[PDB]
């Protein structure tokens, strides 16, 4: 086109640690995230809402709360996202007896949850392996091909870094972790 061509073209023309506010930010938890990966029997509180809001974007939170039962909402929303994306997640606890009922509760709440300890080795093929940190430190030094599929590593009781004979394990782990693992 010659006259139509003109008649159409004339019409066409650093900080690295962000201290998120305790009480203020979240006003719209349901405007975005309308299809939550996990459904509770109650309402998530303010800090649990903020942690979930950052877990959606594949960030790396550092929750520091008082009671252990307020934190496990974050620790199982991360496992619901891991099961939604087909990836894998590692939950690591220091005490051998604490990581048994966690196995029971995570297997009762959803799907497949393997457990690895000094003697137990239930289902080393699931997507929610529960371990003691000395086993993750031992399979980070070799490859172990489980590290190829991780998304989240949920360090459970991170105030054991202060221990005198085991505080070096938490820092060998936090140093040797590759970059694609939140």
């Amino acid at each position: 086109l010659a006259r139509a061509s003109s008649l159409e073209d004339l019409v066409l023309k650093e900080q690295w640690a962000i201290p998120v506010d305790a009480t203020s930010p979240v006003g719209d938890f349901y405007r975005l995230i309308p299809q939550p990966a996990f459904q509770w029997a109650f309402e998530p509180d303010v800090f649990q809402k903020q942690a979930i809001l950052h877990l959606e974007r594949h960030d790396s939170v550092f929750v520091a709360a008082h009671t252990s039962a307020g934190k496990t909402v974050v620790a199982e929303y991360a496992i619901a996202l891991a099961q939604k994306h087909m990836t894998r997640t590692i939950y690591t606890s220091p005490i051998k007896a604490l990581s048994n009922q966690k196995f029971r509760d995570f297997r009762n709440t959803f799907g497949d949850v393997g457990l690895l300890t000094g003697d137990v080795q239930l289902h080393p093929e699931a997507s929610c392996l529960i371990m003691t940190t000395e086993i993750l430190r031992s399979m980070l030094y070799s490859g172990s091909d489980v590290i190829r599929d991780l998304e989240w590593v949920i360090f459970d009781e991170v105030h054991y870094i202060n221990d005198v004979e085991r505080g070096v394990v938490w820092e060998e782990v936090l140093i040797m972790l590759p970059d694609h693992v939140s």
Binding site: A4, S5, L7, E8, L12, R148
Partner: protein, 286 residues
């Protein structure tokens, strides 16, 4: 009561499907008054449902179109031509174009005639020039952008088609054809560092999902380059938009397999083949 009546009639004409079609019938009854030449337009809207309402719509249009129904009778004949084959269209186009000589009021009859004619007629001057006149008659609100989009479908100087795709997506936002076509044909063109800017901008105003057409393209754009982290995140967002499209699952599986992951790629490919079991590539990849 004048301003409200016109708004109600326009809403009835422009409303949703059969339940809203019944709502439109209720609105027409609520505004059962003089100037019945709008009822036929409501009838045309009722034809958008064609279930227990088109027959009433046909009767309502026939009843209303009594004295002249000049625009209404020609438009109704064009609608009948659309329901039938393009035979009636040849008569309607000539009569409407000869009688109502305009560009913007004529643009509605031009779009109806082009929709009837597009079946078989070539129409290099009857409808294509009609769409050109409709593009010269570009209205302020939601009345002539879709015509320009439909005018630039596959041919006729695709470079201005890319320009009026960008304009037809900038003006008309709800549709996810002109924008997708615009970015696709643009990336078909030489320039590459321009598609990414468009996708980033569209993604920013994406509230929660409902932009799968954007997420998917940008994920592929990151997959052609070696940027697997961004590609994986983008494709995960696209699948959260709609977790049934096998193309997304297959492309995400390829993304996982490009970088390390082997059993997560396996899981995604199995899910991709599980639905749409016709695709051989997915089962082979598993």
């Amino acid at each position: 009561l004048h301003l409200k009546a016109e708004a109600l009639i326009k809403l009835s004409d422009y409303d949703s499907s059969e339940e809203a079609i019944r709502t439109l019938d209720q609105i027409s009854d609520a505004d059962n008054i003089p100037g019945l030449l709008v009822l036929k337009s409501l009838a045309y809207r009722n034809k958008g449902s064609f279930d227990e309402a088109a027959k009433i719509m046909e009767d309502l249009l026939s009843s209303y179109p009594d004295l002249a129904e000049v625009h209404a009778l020609e438009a109704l004949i064009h609608f009948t031509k659309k329901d039938y084959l393009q035979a009636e269209k040849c008569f309607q186009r000539a009569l409407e174009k000869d009688t109502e000589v305009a560009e913007y009021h004529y643009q509605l009859g031009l779009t109806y005639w082009f929709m009837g004619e597009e079946t078989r007629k070539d129409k290099t001057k009857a409808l294509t020039h009609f769409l050109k006149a409709a593009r010269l008659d570009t209205y302020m609100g939601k009345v002539f952008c879709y015509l320009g989009h439909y005018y630039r479908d596959v041919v006729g100087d695709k470079n201005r088609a890319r320009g009026c795709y960008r304009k037809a997506f900038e003006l008309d936002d709800t549709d996810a054809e002109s924008g997708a076509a615009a970015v696709d044909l643009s990336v078909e063109l030489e320039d590459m560092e321009m598609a990414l800017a468009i996708l980033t901008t569209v993604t920013q105003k994406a509230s929660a999902g409902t932009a799968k057409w954007a997420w998917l393209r940008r994920g592929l754009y990151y997959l052609k380059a070696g940027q697997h982290s961004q590609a994986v995140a983008d494709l995960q967002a696209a699948l959260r938009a709609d977790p049934k499209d096998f193309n997304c699952w297959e492309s995400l599986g390829e993304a996982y397999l490009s970088r390390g992951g082997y059993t997560t790629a396996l899981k995604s490919f199995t899910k991709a083949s599980e639905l749409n079991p016709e695709s051989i590539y997915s089962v082979f990849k598993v």
